[PDB]
Write a protein that holds these residues in place. Structure first.
Motif, mmCIF file in Angstrom:
data_model
loop_
_atom_site.group_PDB
_atom_site.id
_atom_site.type_symbol
_atom_site.label_atom_id
_atom_site.label_comp_id
_atom_site.label_asym_id
_atom_site.label_seq_id
_atom_site.Cartn_x
_atom_site.Cartn_y
_atom_site.Cartn_z
ATOM 1 N N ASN A 194 63.900 -2.281 -88.181
ATOM 2 C CA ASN A 194 65.256 -2.228 -87.699
ATOM 3 C C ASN A 194 65.954 -0.902 -87.914
ATOM 4 O OD1 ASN A 194 65.072 -4.760 -86.658
ATOM 5 N ND2 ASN A 194 66.249 -5.772 -88.294
ATOM 6 N N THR A 195 65.217 0.194 -88.077
ATOM 7 C CA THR A 195 65.868 1.499 -88.217
ATOM 8 C C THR A 195 65.743 2.156 -86.882
ATOM 9 O OG1 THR A 195 63.787 2.584 -88.930
ATOM 10 C CG2 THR A 195 65.314 1.787 -90.627
ATOM 11 N N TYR A 221 69.537 -8.179 -85.908
ATOM 12 C CA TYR A 221 69.646 -7.527 -87.210
ATOM 13 C C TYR A 221 69.902 -8.449 -88.397
ATOM 14 C CZ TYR A 221 69.514 -3.390 -84.324
ATOM 15 O OH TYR A 221 69.099 -2.417 -83.455
ATOM 16 N N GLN A 246 73.568 -1.680 -92.968
ATOM 17 C CA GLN A 246 73.136 -0.593 -93.813
ATOM 18 C C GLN A 246 72.789 -1.041 -95.247
ATOM 19 O OE1 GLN A 246 73.541 3.150 -92.498
ATOM 20 N NE2 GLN A 246 75.755 3.035 -92.266
ATOM 21 N N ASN A 275 70.107 4.118 -89.425
ATOM 22 C CA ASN A 275 70.309 2.784 -88.904
ATOM 23 C C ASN A 275 71.026 2.825 -87.592
ATOM 24 O OD1 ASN A 275 69.248 1.179 -91.138
ATOM 25 N ND2 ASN A 275 70.881 2.151 -92.297
ATOM 26 N N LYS A 288 69.346 -2.460 -95.550
ATOM 27 C CA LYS A 288 68.334 -1.419 -95.582
ATOM 28 C C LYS A 288 68.257 -0.825 -96.990
ATOM 29 C CE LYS A 288 65.955 -0.885 -92.959
ATOM 30 N NZ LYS A 288 64.618 -1.571 -93.106
#
Ligand SMILES: N[C@@H](Cc1ccc2ccccc2c1)C(=O)O
Length: 307
Positions: free
Chosen positions: A10-11, A247, A48, A193, A51
């Motif tokens: 998901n980046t 996400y 964010q 991101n 992550k």
């Protein structure tokens, strides 16, 4: 996924993937993200932080910079007020399950050597580049201020990267990150991101713009928000509801539906959800109902933990 793939997931980009693999090989690794403190913490921030938690799980020490002075320079108010907001922000990130260390910009960004480095790097950074780097960051202003070009040189200050292997932020930060990568002694790995679309669907999700779902929003407000959200049939691009599904949601996802519109559905990946939707086989209402309910569940322990 091995560690790299969990981090990659998901980046939007990693600069560079081969610098990252080099970092993963070390024991002690550290990753930074900075946030202008925001009054409401929303799904954009949660993306964010998730992550950062990936990195944490991969064995990184996480540093969160509460960028009050940058937020000052970017016209979000008075410093003492920005600081209180930063302390709230801290509480919300800890509720999300991040184990990190927190640093306040004002605590070091007025030190003489830091300031001397702002000036040193202002001599190396052109106005054009500085302004370019801020196109996605600068507060809306008809009469752009000198503060705007100070902001990115401050964000590239070596004090921020001392001892940090990786810096994380949204794609809107990439030009500033590229500048740091050019100007610093040490090239830091950038992990970027994606930037979430607003609920209304024009621009990006923002605390000051009223198009956000805050992680502490009540179930009722989340439904009402996702009810009024932009979300066309078959249109995957710029669809915030599909973004939320991509996400935030765990798969397989069991979408609820009345029998008279095809009955309850199971999608085992976001890939499957995307095709079913883009084929006009899952209608917005049904996707909306499923995203709202799974979100409430996802966010519940955060909102409750915030009491
Ligand atoms: N520019 C960010 C805040 C911000 C400010 C300073 C930083 C220094 C190093 C790494 C990341 C940083 C992010 C924002 O838009 O919230």
């Amino acid at each position: 996924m091995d560690e790299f793939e969990m981090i990659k997931r998901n980046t939007s980009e990693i600069i560079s993937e081969e610098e990252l693999r080099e970092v993963l090989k070390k024991d002690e690794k550290s990753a930074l993200i900075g946030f202008e403190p925001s009054g409401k913490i929303h799904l954009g921030h949660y993306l964010q932080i998730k992550k950062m938690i990936d990195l944490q799980n991969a064995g990184f020490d996480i540093i969160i910079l509460l960028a009050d002075l940058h937020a000052y320079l970017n016209q979000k108010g008075e410093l003492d007020e920005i600081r209180k907001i930063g302390d709230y922000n801290k509480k919300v990130f800890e509720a999300m399950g991040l184990k990190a260390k927190y640093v306040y910009g004002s605590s070091f960004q007025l030190d003489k050597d830091y300031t001397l480095n702002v000036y040193r790097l202002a001599l190396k950074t052109t106005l054009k580049r500085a302004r370019r780097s801020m196109e996605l960051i600068a507060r809306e202003d008809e009469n752009p201020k000198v503060a705007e070009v100070i902001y990115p040189i401050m964000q590239v200050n070596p004090a921020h990267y001392q001892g940090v292997d990786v810096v994380v932020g949204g794609m809107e930060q990439r030009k500033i990150h590229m500048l740091a990568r050019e100007l610093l002694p040490k090239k830091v790995v950038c992990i970027h991101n994606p930037v979430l679309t607003g609920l209304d669907g024009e621009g990006k999700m923002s605390s000051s713009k009223g198009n956000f779902i805050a992680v502490d929003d009540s179930p009722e407000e989340i439904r009402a928000k996702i009810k009024k959200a932009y979300c066309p049939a078959g249109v995957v691009e710029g669809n915030p509801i599909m973004e939320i599904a991509k996400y935030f949601l765990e798969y397989p996802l069991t979408i609820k539906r009345p029998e008279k519109f095809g009955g309850d559905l199971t999608v085992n990946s976001y890939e499957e959800l995307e095709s079913l939707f883009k084929n006009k086989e899952l209608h917005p209402m049904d996707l909306k109902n499923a995203v709202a309910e799974e979100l409430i569940k996802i966010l519940e322990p955060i909102r409750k933990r915030l009491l």
